Design an enzyme around this catalytic site. Structure first.
Site, PDB file in Angstrom:
ATOM      1  N   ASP A  99      32.609  48.088  36.684  1.00 10.94           N
ATOM      2  CA  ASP A  99      32.808  46.862  37.161  1.00 10.94           C
ATOM      3  C   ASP A  99      31.069  46.900  38.657  1.00 10.94           C
ATOM      4  O   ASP A  99      30.600  47.695  37.996  1.00 10.94           O
ATOM      5  CB  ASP A  99      33.887  47.310  38.110  1.00 10.94           C
ATOM      6  CG  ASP A  99      34.179  45.331  38.493  1.00 10.94           C
ATOM      7  OD1 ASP A  99      34.153  44.228  38.019  1.00 10.94           O
ATOM      8  OD2 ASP A  99      34.351  45.352  39.740  1.00 10.94           O
ATOM      9  N   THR A 116      29.793  44.750  40.734  1.00 14.79           N
ATOM     10  CA  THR A 116      29.918  44.582  42.367  1.00 14.79           C
ATOM     11  C   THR A 116      30.633  45.565  42.846  1.00 14.79           C
ATOM     12  O   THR A 116      31.912  44.853  42.488  1.00 14.79           O
ATOM     13  CB  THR A 116      30.004  42.970  42.900  1.00 14.79           C
ATOM     14  OG1 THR A 116      28.744  42.310  41.770  1.00 14.79           O
ATOM     15  CG2 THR A 116      29.754  42.641  43.937  1.00 14.79           C
ATOM     16  N   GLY A 172      38.425  45.827  43.404  1.00 15.36           N
ATOM     17  CA  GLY A 172      38.292  44.594  44.470  1.00 15.36           C
ATOM     18  C   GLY A 172      40.094  44.064  44.438  1.00 15.36           C
ATOM     19  O   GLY A 172      41.052  44.351  43.060  1.00 15.36           O
TER      20      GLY A 172
HETATM   21  N1  LIG Z   1      32.689  34.360  49.224  1.00 19.20           N
HETATM   22  C1  LIG Z   1      32.074  33.525  47.966  1.00 19.20           C
HETATM   23  N2  LIG Z   1      31.920  32.082  48.070  1.00 19.20           N
HETATM   24  C2  LIG Z   1      31.735  31.224  46.414  1.00 19.20           C
HETATM   25  N3  LIG Z   1      31.290  32.097  45.877  1.00 19.20           N
HETATM   26  C3  LIG Z   1      31.735  33.064  45.696  1.00 19.20           C
HETATM   27  C4  LIG Z   1      32.234  34.016  45.894  1.00 19.20           C
HETATM   28  N4  LIG Z   1      32.389  35.078  45.949  1.00 19.20           N
HETATM   29  C5  LIG Z   1      32.476  35.537  44.315  1.00 19.20           C
HETATM   30  N5  LIG Z   1      31.589  34.439  44.114  1.00 19.20           N
HETATM   31  C6  LIG Z   1      31.535  33.672  43.229  1.00 19.20           C
HETATM   32  O1  LIG Z   1      32.399  33.124  42.300  1.00 19.20           O
HETATM   33  C7  LIG Z   1      32.093  34.144  40.857  1.00 19.20           C
HETATM   34  C8  LIG Z   1      33.410  34.424  39.914  1.00 19.20           C
HETATM   35  O2  LIG Z   1      33.210  35.901  41.412  1.00 19.20           O
HETATM   36  P1  LIG Z   1      34.695  37.096  41.020  1.00 19.20           P
HETATM   37  O3  LIG Z   1      34.699  37.164  38.690  1.00 19.20           O
HETATM   38  O4  LIG Z   1      35.853  36.521  41.225  1.00 19.20           O
HETATM   39  O5  LIG Z   1      33.781  38.518  41.602  1.00 19.20           O
HETATM   40  P2  LIG Z   1      32.532  39.703  41.313  1.00 19.20           P
HETATM   41  O6  LIG Z   1      31.843  38.009  42.059  1.00 19.20           O
HETATM   42  O7  LIG Z   1      32.962  40.797  41.592  1.00 19.20           O
HETATM   43  O8  LIG Z   1      32.170  39.270  39.658  1.00 19.20           O
HETATM   44  C9  LIG Z   1      31.155  34.269  40.564  1.00 19.20           C
HETATM   45  O9  LIG Z   1      29.942  34.183  40.382  1.00 19.20           O
HETATM   46  C10 LIG Z   1      30.175  34.777  42.305  1.00 19.20           C
HETATM   47  O10 LIG Z   1      28.952  33.813  42.251  1.00 19.20           O
HETATM   48  F1  ALF Z   2      32.837  40.915  38.223  1.00 15.36           F
HETATM   49 AL1  ALF Z   2      33.349  41.875  39.712  1.00 15.36          AL
HETATM   50  F2  ALF Z   2      34.237  43.046  41.124  1.00 15.36           F
HETATM   51  F3  ALF Z   2      31.759  42.050  39.942  1.00 15.36           F
HETATM   52  F4  ALF Z   2      34.857  42.573  38.592  1.00 15.36           F
HETATM   53 MG   LIG Z   3      34.840  44.419  41.862  1.00 16.92          MG
END
Ligand SMILES: Nc1ncnc2c1ncn2[C@@H]1O[C@H](COP(=O)(O)OP(=O)(O)O)[C@@H](O)[C@H]1O
Ligand code: ALF
Ligand SMILES: [Mg+2]
Ligand SMILES: [Mg+2]
Length: 1140
Positions: A485, A487, A838
């Site tokens: 993963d 982030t 996560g």
């Molecule tokens: N707290 C938040 N508020 C608004 N947008 C968010 C937040 N967290 C993540 N995002 C957006 O959601 C998109 C998808 O993220 P997600 O796949 O759920 O988790 P990760 O970013 O860890 O892969 C990302 O491009 C990010 O910019």
């Molecule tokens: F894409 Al992630 F935590 F950053 F599922």
């Molecule tokens: Mg993660």
């Protein structure tokens, strides 16, 4: 037709008890015994078929053994227990027992006992309560109030006043039981009586009796003591594991419950469904006792037990929901349920039932599930009882035992033939043949896989890594694909806010700098940003302030609040009243009213607020209702009223350097005044997230972890394959993968502009079709990056089998598609590992063969203070923030497999030597002395104790150990060493016969006397056992070598020196201690040469076979091109040169 309606129960039958005299081990033996008694009491019948007084013991032992076997067969197998003791029953009216057999790898079958109460028929299986329903004519699990087939209306929960009748209280207590985790740990006596019936403990006692029948009174005591202490340590290990599992439950704490119209104080273990309980802020080491649904007030919780995340969640009540005619769903109302095992951080208030508030001034909730039926309870129950054991099949060790038994049977048959040719006594010959047969079976061969796993678990728990399902440890030795993963797993947790970019879009700025493709380069800091950008940064957030004065939330929201300069308030208000450069204008107040929380599938977050702000430099006063949205740029682009010209180019340029880009949008509902109390609750997510305007991109910078590159380089060059499954932008994922060396060639991204191949510099554009297969040149000479859209569109076509073999970086995937990718990779035969931290990966962690949940936490938290803090999101859990925890699992599994293979080889080569030495000694009628065999057994036990100490190397190697017994490495080495030992023993026996002739007269006296053959055979078998221990120590390429550790090397040297001093007659007192004969010099020299030749031949054969057949090759997905191998070799040579 099915008696039990459950997916995890295969068969069930109804049975009735039977009296003691009607069992299957009473009547046949009580009708057989008088026949034998009459035969024995008859003088003329005693001569035939009974013979002398010696065969009477044989017949008595045979009939007693048959009776004991018939008795023990009821305990060994459940089917035989049902067949022998119980009898089939016709209807449920006459039935007292039920035979329940589960599905494969789901625990152990049993015979449960029906219980009746007043009509109400129920039983317990694996601590789960099943109830008989007469309408369905079947048994099924308990049915709760929230799981009704018609979903209950919310007026049932809003207007509930708790249980008001004591009769209903008693009925609920009888029906559902108390709210406790029923995990009992028993004493030593119960475990020992449960373990003294197993089929491999009775056999050793039978062997002890067989040895005791042959007048050995010193060996039997020693082996009985060893067996007793081994069983004792196994029982202690099981008790320790049960206590560790018991340590997961929650200690009861006092709580306030509305009962009978009054608020009473009830302990946490006496809660029933339908109660109306007041919740408050939980303390340390305590969580929510049972699953509840809120009816008043708001809570701020931390669901770290069910998900790896620790960010707080904002649970709201269903008080304002119009539930008079609206049926309850779990989709819309997922934010009103409190789960058991989570911690309530804060209780805030910001009724229809008509009840006074509780004295503790907490929120009000209604209990839904209690006991083992909660989510945490169900997960714990499945973890403890109904799980696959460490050695599930046991269809390979039990065949290895038969493989040795074939050799023993051949030797015993030859012994019996050569004994009956010379007219020996039949009883002694039969006893010798039985001894030869039973002296070949290793006692713990089915074990030694469930014994190394405990050592691996202890070594892992040293590194703060905890495992809840120990049967996945061998799987870590065969991992072919290791997913990851982005982030929180490979990048750091703190963030730095670079600024706001793209503020000049829409022709706001004329002389803004711009590159060739049209991207707007200029970036403005958050302090100098516009008013609308400042308010959309302040409004769309989920940060709460605790009563102590701390701020908790997502790290990016804390970072943007710190960079913004505004100060949070108690009642969800943000203000910037002081005027300074820190505030940078835009002074005013913002008060949040409603939040639409962030969802991983939606990729956006919206918020409604009342604002009143003014810009100092240009006036432009603003007030009234306002709504702000933030999310991924692709999602926000679809919702703008009009997209600016250079949107895609700008965010692509700002994400190409490795930054993270968030898109902001804003809308004004009412220009003057508030929207209204009733109108706010009438808004919907679909209506409010439309027709938005544009605000600048928030640009963050995620720093890489210090251990990511080293761990990934360790994983990549050890026959593993590492892939990344992230949900961020394709360009950021490609940049991070290039930095951590996942991809080392040019990268092509398969994404819609539909479904084109594109370059990272956007100079190559290739159109592709979902139905047509992928171009072979693209697969051959490019590194692939497949997005979520193309993966969605490649669902059923022929490309799906070829993408998953040639893609290392998946980007922009929803949490369902992660488990889709994991299932697709698992269905092609590979073994997969997933490491997440996560709620996105929770579905993916439970499908991979190994699942690691990186609980990001500092070492100081552990220093301030262990399955209590561990979660249940993944089978494995590491409490530190180091990526190097992943190699420390794949190394421990490898060491477990290596130790298992070496123990199998050592046991199988130590049994055969003793068998074929006894066979040689029994051809001449002489036998081993008592003291000699006792000394040999004690020395072998000391050698086993000394060899058990082993450490691990600090790096992973390119050789994968064999996972099973029947290979061409174990079988060939065992057969070669056995042949060498047999040849040497036969040669020395023939030479002993040649030097000293045999009188061919075996007298009746069986007293042991010293002889040349006995001493030579005893010394040779001792030296051969020690050589087998010294040679087959599999610790060269995976563990520490033999000579590098003194603990076993000194013991081996001392035992060999003692044996050779006995052989060389240096100490005559030691020679006479074991009743050894004097030797002539020529015999001593020839025996020393024979022993040296035997050791050298065994070592050479083992070394050749290990260098030839031990290496299990890497799979086709893990093979590396010669360029990467050359780069690795050059880098390793440079590191070796620069070491000193
Ligand atoms: N707290 C938040 N508020 C608004 N947008 C968010 C937040 N967290 C993540 N995002 C957006 O959601 C998109 C998808 O993220 P997600 O796949 O759920 O988790 P990760 O970013 O860890 O892969 C990302 O491009 C990010 O910019
Ligand atoms: F894409 Al992630 F935590 F950053 F599922
Ligand atoms: Mg993660
Ligand atoms: Mg996340």
């Amino acid at each position: 037709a099915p008696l039990v309606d459950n997916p995890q129960i295969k068969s069930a039958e109804l049975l009735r008890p039977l009296p003691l005299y009607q069992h299957a081990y009473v009547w046949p033996y009580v009708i057989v015994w008088p026949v034998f008694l009459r035969v024995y009491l008859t003088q003329e019948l005693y001569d035939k078929y009974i013979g002398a007084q010696e065969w009477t013991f044989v017949w008595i032992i045979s009939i007693v053994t048959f009776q004991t076997l018939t008795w023990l067969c009821t305990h060994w197998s459940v089917n035989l227990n049902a067949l022998f003791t119980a009898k089939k029953a016709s209807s449920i009216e006459d039935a007292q027992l039920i035979k329940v057999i589960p599905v494969a790898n789901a625990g152990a079958a049993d015979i449960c006992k029906l219980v009746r109460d007043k009509t109400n028929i129920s039983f317990l299986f694996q601590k789960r309560r099943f109830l008989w329903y007469p309408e369905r004519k079947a048994f099924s699990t308990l049915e709760f109030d929230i799981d009704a087939e018609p979903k209950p209306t919310l007026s049932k929960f809003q207007l509930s006043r708790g249980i008001e009748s004591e009769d209903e209280l008693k009925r609920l207590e009888q029906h559902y039981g108390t709210n406790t985790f029923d995990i009992p740990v028993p004493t030593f006596t119960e475990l020992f009586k449960e373990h003294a019936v197993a089929p491999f403990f009775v056999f050793q006692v039978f062997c002890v009796g067989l040895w005791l029948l042959d007048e050995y009174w010193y060996y039997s005591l020693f082996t009985l003591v060893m067996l007793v202490v081994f069983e004792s340590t196994v029982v202690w290990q099981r008790q320790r594991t049960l206590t560790e599992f018991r340590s997961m439950s929650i200690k009861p704490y006092p709580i306030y419950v509305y009962r009978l119209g009054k608020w009473t104080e009830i302990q946490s273990d006496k809660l029933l469904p339908g109660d109306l309980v007041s919740v408050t802020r939980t303390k340390e080491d305590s969580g929510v006792a049972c699953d509840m649904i809120l009816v008043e007030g708001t809570a701020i919780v931390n669901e770290a037990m069910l998900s790896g995340e620790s960010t707080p969640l904002l649970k709201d009540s269903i008080q304002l929901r119009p539930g008079d005619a609206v049926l309850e769903v779990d989709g819309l109302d997922k934010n009103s349920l409190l789960w058991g095992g989570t911690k309530v951080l804060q209780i805030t208030h910001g009724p229809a039932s008509g009840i006074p508030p509780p004295p503790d001034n907490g929120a009000m909730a209604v209990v839904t599930k209690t006991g083992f039926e909660t989510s945490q309870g169900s997960l714990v129950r499945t973890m403890i009882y109904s799980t696959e054991r460490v050695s599930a099949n046991n269809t390979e060790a039990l065949l290895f035992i038969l493989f040795l038994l074939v050799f023993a049977l051949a030797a015993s048959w030859y012994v019996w033939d050569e004994g009956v040719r010379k007219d020996r006594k039949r009883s002694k010959l039969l006893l010798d043949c039985i001894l030869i047969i039973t002296s070949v079976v290793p006692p713990e061969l089915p074990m030694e896989l469930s014994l190394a796993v405990n050592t691996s678990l202890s070594a892992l728990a040293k590194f703060a890594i905890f495992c809840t399902e120990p049967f996945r440890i061998p799987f870590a030795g065969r991992i072919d694909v290791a997913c990851f993963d982005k982030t929180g797993t490979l990048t750091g947790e703190d963030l730095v806010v670079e600024g706001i970019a793209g503020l000049g879009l829409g022709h706001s700025g004329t002389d803004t700098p711009k590159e060739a493709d049209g991207a707007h380069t200029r970036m403005v800091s958050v302090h100098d940003a516009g008013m609308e950008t400042t308010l959309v940064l302040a409004t769309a957030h989920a940060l709460v302030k605790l009563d102590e004065g701390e701020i908790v939330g997502d790290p990016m929201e804390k970072a943007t609040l710190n960079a913004l300069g505004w100060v949070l308030g108690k009642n969800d208000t943000l203000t910037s009243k002081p005027g300074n450069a820190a505030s940078s204008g835009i002074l005013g107040t913002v008060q949040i009213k409603r939040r639409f929380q962030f969802s991983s599938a939606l990729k956006r977050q919206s918020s409604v607020a009342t604002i009143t702000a003014t810009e100092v430099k240009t006036g432009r006063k603003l007030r009234g209702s306002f709504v702000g949205v933030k999310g991924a740029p692709e999602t926000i682009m679809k919702m703008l009223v009009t997209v600016p010209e250079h949107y895609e180019e700008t965010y692509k340029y700002f994400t190409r350097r490795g930054s993270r880009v968030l898109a902001l949008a804003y809308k004004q509902l009412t220009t003057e005044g508030e929207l209204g109390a009733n109108k706010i609750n009438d808004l919907k997510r679909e209506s409010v997230e439309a027709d938005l305007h544009f605000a600048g991109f928030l640009v963050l910078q995620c720093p890489l972890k210090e251990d990511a590159k080293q761990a990934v380089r360790m994983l990549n060059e050890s026959s593993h394959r590492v892939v990344m499954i992230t949900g961020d932008n394709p360009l950021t994922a490609v940049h991070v993968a290039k930095e951590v060396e996942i991809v080392d060639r040019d990268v092509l991204i398969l994404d819609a502009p539909s479904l084109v191949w594109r370059s990272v510099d956007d100079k190559i554009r290739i159109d592709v079709d979902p139905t047509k297969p992928i171009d072979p040149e693209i697969l051959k000479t490019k590194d692939l990056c497949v997005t979520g859209y193309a993966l969605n569109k490649f669902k059923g076509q022929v490309g799906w089998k070829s993408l998953l073999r040639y893609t290392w970086v998946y980007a922009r995937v929803s949490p369902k598609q992660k488990e889709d990718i994991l299932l697709g990779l698992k269905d092609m035969g590979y073994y997969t590992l997933m490491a997440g931290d996560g709620t996105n990966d929770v579905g993916a962690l439970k499908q991979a063969h190994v699942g690691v949940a990186l609980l990001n936490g500092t070492q100081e938290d552990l220093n301030r203070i262990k399955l209590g803090d561990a979660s249940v999101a993944a089978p494995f859990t590491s409490k530190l923030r180091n990526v190097m925890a992943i190699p420390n699992i794949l190394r421990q599994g490898r060491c477990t497999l290596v130790a298992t293979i070496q123990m199998y080889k050592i046991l199988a080569l130590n049994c055969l030597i003793s068998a074929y030495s006894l066979s040689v000694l029994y051809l001449e009628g002489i036998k081993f002395g008592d003291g000699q065999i006792t000394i040999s057994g004690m020395l072998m036990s000391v050698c086993f104790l000394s060899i058990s100490r082993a450490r691990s190397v600090e790096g992973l190697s390119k050789e994968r150990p064999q996972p099973n017994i029947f290979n061409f490495y174990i079988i060939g080495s065992i057969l070669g060493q056995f042949a060498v030992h047999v040849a040497t023993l036969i040669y020395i026996a023939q030479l002993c016969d040649q030097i000293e002739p045999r009188t061919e007269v075996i007298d009746l006296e069986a007293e042991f006397k010293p002889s040349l053959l006995n001493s030579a055979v005893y010394l040779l078998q001792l030296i051969q056992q020690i050589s087998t221990f010294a040679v087959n120590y599999q610790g060269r390429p995976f563990r520490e070598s033999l000579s590098e550790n003194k603990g076993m090397f000194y013991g081996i040297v001392g035992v060999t020196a003692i044996a050779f001093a006995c052989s060389t007659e240096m100490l005559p007192e030691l020679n006479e201690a074991m009743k050894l004969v004097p030797f002539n010099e020529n015999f001593k020299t020839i025996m020393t040469t024979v022993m040296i030749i035997d050791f050298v031949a065994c070592y050479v054969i083992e070394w050749v076979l290990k260098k030839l057949f031990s290496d299990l090759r890497a799979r086709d997905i893990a093979e590396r091109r010669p360029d990467q191998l050359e780069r690795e070799r050059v880098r390793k040579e440079k590191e070796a040169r620069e070491k000193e």
